[PDB]
Design a protein around this ligand. Structure first.
Ligand SMILES: CC(C)=CCC/C(C)=C/CC/C(C)=C/CC/C(C)=C/CC/C(C)=C\CC/C(C)=C/CC/C(C)=C/CC/C(C)=C\CC/C(C)=C/CC1=C(C)C(=O)c2ccccc2C1=O
Ligand code: SF4
Ligand code: SF4
Ligand code: SF4
Ligand code: SF4
Ligand code: FES
Lengths: 124, 166, 187, 219, 183, 407
C-alpha cells in the first residue's frame, strides 16, 4: 500500500521542500509515498489520532507549536505511534531533538538527500 | 504585652477599612510615567515628511536585533523625508524588542520616539512584527501626505534646525 | 636587504632600506592617522594627516612620505605633543567643510574619516562659518556615484586610476578650495 | 619571560577582523598584550602581601610557584604556576599575615591566541581580617586543560570550578565530581569557549531575517 | 466529554457560550514563574493591580488544578523538558501565555542556552511583548485570552473550526516571503 | 537503610523554589537527610551573548542577570568598564550620588521581594501583598527615572543614561517619608509575630565558619555577627561619604537573616535621605566627549526621543558632534585591554564582576560572581537534618534569585 507521511509545518515552503526531497516514490525499491500536509498543531494531532501514517515530519520551527513539542506529545498520546522525524532550525537544537525522542533529526535548511536518506532509514 | 506579636491583625483589619489601592485597569488604567519605554513610534515633521532617514542607527544600537531598516533614495517624484535617504522598510520585532531605549538614544533625527502606549499582544508570532505603516505617527492636522516635495524654499538643514511649519 | 635601524617613539626597530615612516610605525604597532597614504600607491603626502616629529627636523614630516634613514628618531602623536597638535589641526581642517552626512553616507560605520576623527579629532566643531557645498551625488559612470563634499581630496582614486590602472578618466579638477575629483565632461 | 601575554593580534586599523572595508588600511600589526609584570614596588598593601608571601614560601618555592605579578588599575594579579596552585592557596588562606579566608569563586577566560596558555582560571581572594583582596591566575594549555582543584583549601570553589569546567572544559583534577552544573550532562561542547559558536537563530521579519550577532560584521 | 457530544443546535451553542464564559472567568494560572517576568507576574497579582479581579487570584501550585500557564520567563534548554512536563501535566482544557520576549521568541537572548520561544515545546495561545511586560500589559494579554476562550467551539463545532483553521493556515505565505517595499 | 528514605524533587516547578531551582531531597519520612542542588534551569547564555555586543550595550544584558538587583548588576558592570578605562576618578559627583540612591532603593525593593516571597512560602500570604505595595512604591520611582520597571539600562559606563526627571527628587523624598511607615506595616505582620518567629528562629543555622568555607556573603554572612559589607570595607561609587550602619545579627539562622534584611531596608532609607541631601545639580556623564554617551533624551508631545537641541547640534552644526554620536552609538567606546575584578555589595552578598577587554568595542569577558550562586552552596548546610518545612524557610532566607545563579 502507499505510505502516508504527515509533513507538519506552518511554513508552506518547508512543506514543499520536504515534498521535493521525497518524491512520490523515494528509493524505487520502496512503496509509493502519500503526503498529507498540516499547518496547525491541532490538525496534526488529529491526523495522527486517525493513524495509519508510516512517518511524520514535524518542522521543529513551527510557529504556534513547534514540531518538537508535537513530537513529544504524539509519542505520549498515540499508542503505536509512527516514527517521527524533526526538522531543527538550529544546530544547538539537537539536544531538544534528542529529548523529543524523534527517531531522527534533520537540520534546516532541508538537505534533500539527507532528508531522503533519513526517511528511508525510518521507513525501512 | 504579647500584643506586639498580634500587630499583624491590627494591620489587616485596618487595611480592610482603608480604600483599596488597585489601579482600575482597563476601565481606569493607571498613569504610566511620562518617561516610560512604550511602543516605538515613527514621527513626522509638521509638513508631514517622515523624520526617519533610514540610517539604521536605531537598528544598529538595538542589543536584541529587534529593528530591521532598509534605506532608499528620496527623489522629486517621490520624497518621504528631507535629504537623500529615507527608511523605506522599517520593522520592529516586538517579540525581540526589550524596550531598552537604546534605539531612541541612537536615532539622530528624533524620528524614533517611545510613546507611553503599551497595550500590545497578539495570537500570531507574525502579528507582533510591526511594520512602518503601523508605527508612523498619526498624520496630524496641517500635515500632507508623506510623498511630497520639501516645504517651499526649505532644505533638510531647515528641517533639522526645527525651522519648518505646516 | 640592507636594514636600517631607527627609533619610533621611544622604541627601536630595523626595517628594509627605503621603507616609509608610516610603514615602520605600522610594523611596530602604531596607528599614525592617514588618508592619502596607500601602501600600493606611490606616496603623495597630500592630505598631511600623517605628520610626525622627526629629530633634527623643524617642520613635522608626512610619515607616509618620509623614507627611513639610519639612526633617525621619530615621535608620533602618542609621544610628540607637537605631532599630536599637527595631526589634530589637520583633522579639524579636514572636517570643517565635510557634510553632516554620516547617517545618510554609505561609508558610515566603515569610514576611515569617522574613525580617525574619533581617535585623532577634537570633541566638537570650532567652525561656525559656512561649509563648502557641491550638488551631489553626481554619477561619474553607470556604477560609481561621486559626493564631492565628502571628498577629502586625498587623490587615492585618481592615483589608483593612473598608477595601478592606466585609466585616468577622472582627475583632480578646478583649483583651491574648489578642487574636486571629476570626469572630463560627460565621458 | 617578562614579555607580556598577547591574547590577540589585531591586523589593520579600525579593528577589522578581516581584510577590511577600505583598501590600504590593513597593514598595521597591533598585538593585544595584557599588562606585563609590575616592576617591584607594588602599590599599597600589595608589596606587604607579596613580600609576606615570598617570606612564607622559600625563594626557590616562591620563584617556581609565582610566574608573574601584575598590578593593574590598583588590582593585584598573581599569575601563579599550575601544579603549585594548591600550595600557594593554602599559604594564602592559612598564613595569619595573609589570611585570605574568602575565595569568592573561580572564573574561566579563554584566550585561544595565547600559545600554551589558552585557558586562565581566575581566583578572587579576599582577606576580611586584613581587608585586602587579590586575584590568582592559573594558565593551562588547551591540549592539557588540567588544573589542580582548590577544594581542600576553598570549598566554595567546588561549584565555581564546576561551572568553569562546564563552560570551558578546564579539568580541575582532584575535584570530587566535575559534573556540568549549568548545562545538561549530555551537552556537547563548552559554550564559553570562543571556538563554540554562539548558537543563535535568525530573527524573523516580514520578508527578511537578521542573522545572529556572531555572523554579522564586527570591529 | 458528553458536553461536547450535544447536537449542533441551540443546546451546543449555549453550552459553548456558558462554558467559555466560565473558563474565561476562572482562568487559574499555574505557579510557574521563570525569570524577570515572574517578578512582574507577582507584581500583577500585587495590590497595585489585582489579577484576582479577573478570577485569577488562585495561582494553582499543582499543575492539575492550573488551567493556564504564564510562561513568564526565559526557557533555557535544560528547562524545556521540565516546562513541557508541567504543561502536559495540566488537565485539559489548558492555554499557554508566552509572557515576555524571552518566552515568546527568545527575546534578546538569541543564544544556544535559550530555546527561542516556548512555541518550540508547547502550543502558545497568546504572545506578549515586553522585557518585562508591565502588569497592565499582562492583564491586556490575559483579557485577549479571555476573548479567545469565550469564542471557543466545542464538539462538532470544534472539529469544524479545526478544519477551517487548518485550511486557512495552509495558504498564508511565510513571514520571510512577505517582501513589501523591501526592494 | 534504603527503604525508609524517599528521594523527592522540590523541583523547578514548586512555589518555594522560584520555578527554576531544583532541590533534590533525600528525606527520612519528612526530615531532610541530604539536599542536592540542581542549577542551570534558568541558564541564559548572558555571559557569552555579551561578547557579541558593545560596551554600554552589554548593560542591557547584565541588568537581566540578577533581575531583582538590576541597578547593582549595572553598577558593577559600569564600574568595571570605568576601572578598565581609568575613568573612575572622572565620573561626575551627581552620577555617583544617583547611583548610590538607586542601588539603595533597589536594595529596599530586592529585600521587599525576598521577604514577600519568603512569607508566602511560609504561608504568610499577606506578606506578599504588603511587601509588593511597598515595592510598587519604589517601582513607580524607577519607572519615572528610567522608564522601565525592571531590567533598567539606566546606569551606564561613565555615568547614567540620563538625568533625573524634574519630579524625581520629590518622588524620592516622598519615598523617604513613607517607606518607614509602610515598612512598619509589613513588620507588624512578621517581626514579632509568634508563628513567623517560630518558623524561622533557629532554622537554617549556619556558622560563621560555614559561611567562610562556602564563600557565603550578604545577609547570610552578617547574620553570624560579622560586620562585613563591601560598602564599608572596599568602598565603591562614593559610599565613603555616607553615614550608615552595617546591619548584623547574632542568631546565625533564618530569623537573623530576615531581621538583617528588615534593618538593611531602614539603613537604605537613611542612605537615600543622605543622597537627597548631597544631590547637587551637575552632569551625569563624564565630560570627555570621546567616551560619553552622546544621546540626550528629552520628552515631547511625540514621546521620549533625542532632545531636539541635540538633533540640531549633530545634524545642522557639529560635524565632530555627528561623528561622535554615530561612533559611540554604533561601534561604541573601545576599552583598553586588561582585566579587572570589581565587587559590589548586592543585597544578596558580594556581587563580583570579572571583566576582560581585548582593546575592542565589545567585551572580551564578563563573568558575574553572583552572590546567589555561591549562597546556594548553603542549601546542604541549612537544610540537611532539618524539617522540609524548615528547609523551605532556610532556602527563602538565602533569598536566591535564580537569574543571577544561572546567568
Ligand atoms: C426556580 C428556582 C429558584 C430554582 C433554583 C434551582 C437551583 C439554582 C438549585 C440549587 C441547588 C443545586 C445547586 C442543585 C443542583 C445539583 C448540584 C448540587 C450539582 C453539583 C455539581 C457539582 C458537584 C459541581 C458543579 C459546580 C457547583 C455548582 C458545585 C457546588 C458549589 C460549589 C461552590 C462547589 C465547588 C467550588 C468550590 C467550593 C471551590 C473551587 C476551588 C477553589 C480553590 C475556589 C476558589 C478559591 C479559594 C477557595 C481559595 O482558597 C483561594 C485563596 C486565595 C486566592 C484565591 C482562591 C480561590 O480562587
Ligand atoms: S528611526 Fe532614526 S535611527 Fe532609525 S533609521 Fe530612522 S532616522 Fe535612523
Ligand atoms: S526598545 Fe531596545 S530592543 Fe526594542 S527596538 Fe528599541 S533599542 Fe531595540
Ligand atoms: S573621491 Fe578620490 S580624492 Fe576624494 S576622498 Fe575619495 S579617493 Fe580621495
Ligand atoms: S523577557 Fe526580559 S524581563 Fe522577561 S524574563 Fe526575559 S529578560 Fe527578564
Ligand atoms: S597620509 Fe601622509 S599626508 Fe596623507
Amino acid at each position: 500500500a502507499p505510505l502516508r507521511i504527515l509533513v507538519y509545518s506552518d511554513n508552506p515552503r518547508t512543506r514543499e521542500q520536504v515534498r521535493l526531497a521525497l518524491g512520490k516514490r523515494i528509493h524505487p525499491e520502496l512503496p509509493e509515498i502519500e503526503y498529507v500536509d498540516v499547518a496547525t498543531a491541532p490538525m496534526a494531532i488529529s491526523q495522527m489520532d486517525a493513524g495509519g501514517f508510516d512517518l511524520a515530519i514535524l518542522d521543529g520551527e513551527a510557529t504556534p507549536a513547534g514540531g518538537m513539542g508535537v513530537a513529544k506529545q504524539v509519542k505520549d498520546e498515540i499508542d503505536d505511534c509512527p516514527p517521527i522525524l524533526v526538522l531543527t532550525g538550529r544546530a544547538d537544537d539537537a539536544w531538544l531533538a534528542k529529548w523529543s525522542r524523534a527517531e531522527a533529526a534533520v537540520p534546516h535548511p532541508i538537505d534533500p538527500i539527507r532528508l531522503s536518506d533519513a526517511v528511508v532509514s525510518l521507513l525501512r | 504585652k504579647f500584643l506586639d506579636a498580634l500587630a499583624g491583625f491590627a494591620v489587616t483589619l485596618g487595611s480592610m477599612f482603608k480604600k483599596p489601592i488597585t489601579e482600575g485597569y482597563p476601565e481606569k488604567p493607571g498613569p504610566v510615567a511620562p518617561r516610560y519605554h512604550g511602543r516605538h513610534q515613527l514621527n513626522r515633521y509638521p509638513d508631514g515628511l517622515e523624520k526617519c532617514i533610514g540610517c539604521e542607527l536605531c537598528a544598529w544600537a538595538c542589543p536584541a536585533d529587534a529593528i530591521y531598516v532598509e534605506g532608499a533614495d528620496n527623489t522629486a517624484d517621490e520624497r518621504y523625508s528631507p535629504g537623500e535617504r529615507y527608511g523605506r522598510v522599517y520593522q520592529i520585532n516586538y517579540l525581540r524588542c526589550i524596550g531598552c531605549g537604546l534605539c531612541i538614544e541612537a536615532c539622530p533625527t528624533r524620528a524614533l520616539t517611545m510613546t507611553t502606549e503599551y497595550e500590545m499582544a497578539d495570537d500570531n508570532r507574525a502579528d507582533l512584527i510591526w511594520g512602518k505603516d503601523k508605527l508612523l505617527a498619526p498624520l496630524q492636522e496641517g500635515m500632507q501626505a508623506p510623498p511630497h516635495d520639501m516645504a517651499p524654499g526649505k532644505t533638510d538643514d531647515d528641517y533639522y534646525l526645527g525651522n519648518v511649519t505646516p | 636587504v640592507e636594514m636600517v635601524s631607527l627609533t619610533i617613539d621611544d622604541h627601536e626597530i630595523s626595517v628594509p632600506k627605503g621603507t616609509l615612516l608610516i610603514r615602520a610605525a605600522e610594523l611596530m604597532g602604531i596607528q599614525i592617522p592617514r588618508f592619502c597614504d596607500h601602501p600600493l600607491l606611490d606616496p603623495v603626502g597630500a592630505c598631511r594627516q600623517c605628520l610626525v616629529e622627526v629629530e633634527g627636523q623643524r617642520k613635522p614630516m608626512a610619515s607616509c612620505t618620509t623614507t627611513v634613514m639610519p639612526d633617525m628618531v621619530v615621535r608620533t602623536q602618542f609621544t610628540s605633543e607637537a605631532a599630536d597638535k599637527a595631526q589634530r589641526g589637520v583633522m579639524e581642517l579636514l572636517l570643517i567643510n565635510h557634510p553632516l552626512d554620516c547617517p545618510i553616507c554609505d561609508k558610515g560605520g566603515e569610514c576611515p574619516l569617522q574613525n580617525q576623527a574619533m581617535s585623532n579629532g577634537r570633541p566638537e566643531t570650532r567652525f561656525e562659518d559656512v561649509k563648502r557645498t557641491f550638488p551631489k551625488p553626481i554619477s561619474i559612470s553607470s556604477q560609481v556615484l561621486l559626493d564631492r563634499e565628502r571628498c577629502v581630496l586625498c587623490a587615492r582614486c585618481t592615483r589608483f586610476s593612473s598608477q595601478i590602472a592606466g585609466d585616468p578618466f577622472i582627475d583632480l579638477m578646478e583649483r583651491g578650495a574648489l578642487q574636486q575629483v571629476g570626469i572630463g565632461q560627460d565621458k | 619571560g617578562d614579555e607580556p601575554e598577547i591574547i590577540a593580534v589585531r591586523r589593520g586599523m579600525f579593528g577589522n577582523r578581516d581584510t577590511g572595508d577600505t583598501s590600504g588600511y590593513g597593514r598595521l600589526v597591533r598585538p593585544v598584550a595584557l599588562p606585563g609584570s609590575t616592576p617591584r614596588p607594588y602599590g599599597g598593601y600589595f608589596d606587604a602581601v607579596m613580600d609576606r608571601l615570598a617570606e612564607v614560601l622559600g625563594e626557590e618555592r616562591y620563584a617556581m610557584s609565582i610566574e608573574r605579578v601584575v598590578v593593574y588599575r590598583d588590582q593585584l594579579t598573581i599569575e601563579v604556576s599550575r601544579v603549585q596552585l594548591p600550595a600557594v592557596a593554602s599559604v594564602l588562606r592559612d598564613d595569619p599575615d595573609l589570611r585570605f579566608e574568602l575565595c569568592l569563586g573561580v572564573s574561566g577566560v579563554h584566550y585561544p591566541e595565547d600559545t600554551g596558555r589558552e585557558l586562565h582560571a581566575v581566583y578572587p581572594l579576599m582577606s576580611i581580617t586584613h581587608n585586602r583582596r587579590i586575584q590568582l591566575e592559573v594558565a593551562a594549555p588547551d591540549a592539557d586543560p588540567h588544573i589542580p582543584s582548590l577544594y581542600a583549601v576553598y570549598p566554595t570553589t567546588d561549584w565555581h570550578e564546576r561551572e568553569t569546567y562546564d563552560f570551558f572544559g578546564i579539568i580541575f583534577d582532584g575535584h570530587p565530581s566535575l559534573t556540568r552544573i549549568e548545562m545538561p550532562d549530555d551537552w556537547e561542547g563548552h559554550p564559553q569557549r570562543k571556538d563554540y559558536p554562539l548558537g543563535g537563530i535568525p530573527v524573523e521579519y516580514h520578508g527578511a531575517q537578521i542573522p545572529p550577532p556572531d555572523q554579522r560584521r564586527s570591529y | 466529554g458528553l458536553e461536547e457530544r450535544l447536537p449542533g443546535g441551540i443546546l451546543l451553542s449555549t453550552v459553548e457560550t456558558v462554558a467559555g464564559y466560565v473558563r474565561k472567568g476562572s482562568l487559574w494560572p499555574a505557579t510557574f514563574g521563570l525569570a524577570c517576568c515572574a517578578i512582574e507576574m507577582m507584581s500583577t497579582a500585587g495590590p497595585r493591580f489585582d489579577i484576582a479581579r479577573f478570577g485569577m487570584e488562585r495561582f494553582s501550585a499543582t499543575p492539575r488544578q492550573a488551567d493556564l500557564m504564564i510562561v513568564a520567563g526565559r526557557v533555557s534548554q535544560k528547562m524545556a523538558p521540565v516546562l513541557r512536563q508541567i504543561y502536559d501535566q495540566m488537565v485539559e482544557p489548558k492555554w499557554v501565555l508566552a509572557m515576555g520576549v524571552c518566552a515568546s521568541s527568545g527575546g534578546m537572548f538569541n543564544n544556544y542556552a535559550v530555546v527561542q520561544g516556548v512555541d518550540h515545546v508547547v502550543p502558545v495561545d497568546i504572545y506578549l511583548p515586553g522585557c518585562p511586560p508591565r502588569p497592565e500589559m499582562l492583564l491586556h494579554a490575559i483579557l485577549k485570552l479571555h476573548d479567545k476562550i469565550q469564542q471557543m467551539p466545542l464538539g462538532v463545532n470544534r472539529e469544524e473550526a479545526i478544519r477551517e483553521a487548518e485550511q486557512a493556515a495552509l495558504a498564508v505565505p511565510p513571514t520571510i516571503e512577505l517582501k513589501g517595499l523591501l526592494r | 537503610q534504603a527503604g525508609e528514605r524517599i528521594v523527592v524533587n522540590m523541583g523547578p516547578q514548586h512555589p518555594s523554589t522560584h520555578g527554576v531551582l531544583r532541590l533534590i531531597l533525600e528525606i527520612e519520612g519528612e526530615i531532610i537527610t541530604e539536599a542536592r542542588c540542581g542549577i542551570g534551569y534558568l541558564h541564559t547564555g548572558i555571559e557569552k551573548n555579551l561578547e557579541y555586543r558593545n560596551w554600554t550595550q552589554g548593560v542591557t544584558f547584565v541588568t537581566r542577570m540578577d533581575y531583582l538587583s538590576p541597578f547593582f548588576n549595572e553598577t558593577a558592570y559600569c564600574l568595571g568598564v570605568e576601572k578598565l578605562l581609568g575613568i573612575t576618578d572622572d565620573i561626575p559627583e551627581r552620577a555617583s550620588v544617583i547611583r548610590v540612591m538607586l542601588m539603595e532603593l533597589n536594595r529596599i525593593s530586592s529585600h521587599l521581594v525576598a521577604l514577600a516571597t519568603g512569607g508566602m512560602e511560609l504561608g504568610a500570604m499577606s506578606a506578599m501583598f504588603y511587601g509588593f505595595r511597598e515595592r510598587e512604591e519604589i517601582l513607580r520611582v524607577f519607572e519615572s527615572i528610567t522608564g522601565l520597571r525592571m531590567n533598567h539600562a539606566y546606569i551606564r559606563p561613565g555615568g547614567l543614561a540620563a538625568d533625573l526627571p524634574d519630579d524625581a527628587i520629590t518622588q524620592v523624598r516622598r519615598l523617604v517619608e513613607i517607606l518607614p511607615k509602610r515598612l512598619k506595616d509589613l513588620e507588624d505582620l512578621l517581626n514579632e509575630n509568634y508563628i513567623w518567629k517560630a518558623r524561622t528562629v533557629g532554622v537554617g543555622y549556619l556558622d560563621l565558619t560555614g559561611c567562610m568555607a562556602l564563600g557565603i556573603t550578604g545577609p547570610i554572612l552578617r547574620s553570624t555577627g560579622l560586620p562585613h559589607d563591601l560598602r564599608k570595607a572596599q568602598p565603591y561609587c562614593g559610599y565613603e561619604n555616607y553615614e550608615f550602619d552595617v546591619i548584623t545579627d547574632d542568631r546565625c539562622d533564618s530569623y537573623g537573616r530576615y531581621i538583617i534584611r528588615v534593618k538593611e531596608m531602614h539603613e537604605s532609607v537613611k542612605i537615600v535621605e543622605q543622597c537627597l541631601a548631597r544631590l547637587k545639580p551637575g552632569p551625569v556623564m563624564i565630560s570627555d566627549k570621546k567616551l560619553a554617551w552622546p544621546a540626550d533624551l528629552k520628552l515631547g508631545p511625540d514621546g521620549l526621543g533625542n532632545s531636539p537641541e541635540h538633533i540640531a547640534k549633530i545634524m545642522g552644526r557639529s560635524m565632530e558632534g555627528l561623528i561622535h554620536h554615530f561612533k559611540l552609538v554604533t561601534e561604541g567606546i573601545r576599552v583598553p585591554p586588561g582585566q579587572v575584578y570589581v565587587a559590589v555589595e548586592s543585597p544578596r552578598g558580594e556581587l563580583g564582576v570579572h571583566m576582560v577587554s581585548d582593546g575592542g568595542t565589545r567585551p572580551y569577558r564578563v563573568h558575574y560572581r553572583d552572590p546567589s550562586f555561591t549562597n546556594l552552596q548553603a542549601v546542604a548546610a541549612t537544610c540537611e537534618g532539618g524539617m522540609v518545612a524548615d528547609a523551605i524557610a532556610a532556602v527563602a532566607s538565602i533569598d536566591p534569585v535564580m537569574g543571577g545563579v544561572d546567568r
